[PDB]
C-alpha cells in the first residue's frame, strides 16, 4: 500500500508544515506537524486541560468506536524548544493520505506547554524518528512509519517540502517526477535514535567547496539550518550589513540584501540552497532588518538540517533494516 498527503506551511514564513491526519472511526481529522526529530504522535484531545487549548481541533477518543485505552501507559515529552506535554495513551486507526494503520498508539495530551496552546494551527505532532525515542512508558510505542512498514510497497517515506507553498509527504513509494537528476543516498546512524547523517562539506555562493565532515540530523521539525559556528560565520561573511544580534538572538541582515546561496555536500553530490530560502523574513513587523535562516548550532549541541535546507531538496527517508537518507535536487 501507499499514501500521499499534502503538507502546507502554517504561516507566510514557512515556520512549520502541517499535514492533515485521520484518527479513529469515523475519522477525526487533525492537522499534525510531521517531525522527523521525535517519535511521538500526540494530539490535543478531550482530555487536555481546557485553559490550555486556544483554537486547536481536539481528538475525542470516546467518539471513536475503534479507540482503546492503553492502561498503564503514560508519556511525557520536552522539545529543544523547551516545549513540553504529557498524557495517557490510546490505540486507534490512523490514516495518512489513504494509507491506513490500525492500532497506532495515539498519545492524548492531558497537559500542554504554552507554546503549543498559543499555536492554533498545529493540533498535535506526528513523530518520524526511530522508535527508540518514543516516550510512552512503561513500554515504548512504534511510530506510524514503523507500524506502516509491513504494508508499504517500499519501506520508505519522502518529504517534498514547499518554499512558501504546499508540498507532499509520500509513504511507500518514490515519485520520480518530483525531483531532478538522481537521488544520492547517504548512511544513517540511529545511535542517538535520529536521522543522523554526515554531510561532506559546503560552499558559500560561487566560492570553493570546502571538504569537512558535518554530522547533523535531518529534522523536518526545525525551521532553520543549524550549522557549526565557523561555517555560519563564513557564510554571513559574504553579506555586508549582516551581523550577530544578542538582542534578537542570531544573524540578522538588511531585508533589501541579496543573500549568496549555500551548498551542502551529500556524498559526492551537492545541494544548493537559494539565497532567497535563507532570508527568513523581517525580524519584527515592517522592520528593514531581516532574520537569517542559517544559524549557529553551537548552543544546541547538534547540527540540524532543518526545513530551510530540506525544502531545497527531495529527501527520501529509507527505513530498510540498514536505513539511509536519499537527497535529490528539485
Amino acid at each position: 500500500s501507499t499514501g500521499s498527503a499534502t503538507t502546507t506551511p502554517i504561516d507566510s514564513l514557512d515556520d512549520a508544515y502541517i499535514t492533515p491526519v485521520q484518527i479513529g472511526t469515523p475519522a477525526q481529522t487533525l492537522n499534525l506537524d510531521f517531525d522527523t526529530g521525535s517519535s511521538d504522535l500526540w494530539v490535543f484531545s478531550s482530555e487536555t486541560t481546557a485553559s490550555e487549548v486556544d483554537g486547536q481541533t481536539i481528538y475525542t477518543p470516546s467518539k471513536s468506536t475503534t479507540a482503546k485505552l492503553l492502561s498503564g501507559a503514560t508519556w511525557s515529552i520536552s522539545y529543544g524548544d523547551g516545549s513540553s506535554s504529557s498524557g495517557d495513551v490510546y490505540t486507534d486507526t490512523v490514516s495518512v493520505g489513504g494509507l491506513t494503520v490500525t492500532g497506532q498508539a495515539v498519545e492524548s495530551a492531558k497537559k500542554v506547554s504554552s507554546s503549543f496552546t498559543e499555536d492554533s494551527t498545529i493540533d498535535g505532532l506526528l513523530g518520524l524518528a526511530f522508535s527508540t525515542l518514543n516516550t510512552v512508558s512503561p513500554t515504548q510505542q512504534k511510530t506510524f512509519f514503523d507500524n506502516a512498514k509491513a504494508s508499504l510497497d517500499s519501506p520508505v517515506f519522502t518529504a517534498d517540502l514547499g518554499y512558501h507553498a504546499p508540498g507532499t509527504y509520500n509513504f511507500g513509494f518514490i515519485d520520480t517526477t518530483a525531483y531532478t537528476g538522481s537521488i544520492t543516498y547517504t548512511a544513517v546512524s540511529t545511535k542517538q535514535g535520529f536521522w543522523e547523517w554526515t554531510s561532506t562539506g559546503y560552499a558559500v555562493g560561487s566560492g570553493t567547496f570546502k571538504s569537512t565532515s558535518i554530522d547533523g540530523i535531518a529534522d523536518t521539525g526545525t525551521t532553520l539550518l543549524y550549522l557549526p559556528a565557523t561555517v555560519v560565520s563564513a557564510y554571513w561573511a559574504q553579506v555586508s550589513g549582516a551581523k550577530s544580534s544578542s538582542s534578537v538572538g542570531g544573524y540578522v541582515f538588511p531585508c533589501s540584501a541579496t543573500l549568496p546561496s549555500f551548498t551542502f555536500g551529500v556524498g559526492s553530490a551537492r545541494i544548493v540552497i537559494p539565497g532567497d530560502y535563507i532570508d527568513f523574513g523581517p525580524i519584527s513587523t515592517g522592520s528593514s532588518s531581516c532574520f537569517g535562516g542559517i544559524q549557529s548550532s553551537a548552543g544546541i549541541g547538534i547540527n540540524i538540517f532543518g526545513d530551510v535546507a530540506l525544502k531545497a531538496a527531495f529527501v527520501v527517508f529509507n527505513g530498510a533494516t540498514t536505513p539511509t537518507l536519499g537527497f535529490a535536487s528539485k
Binding site: 515556520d15 506537524d33 522527523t36 526529530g37 520536552s78 522539545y79 524548544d81 526545525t222 525551521t223 523574513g281
Partner: peptide, 7 residues
Amino acid sequence: XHPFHXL
C-alpha cells in the same frame, strides 16, 4: 521570527 525546534 518564530523558529521551531522539535528532541
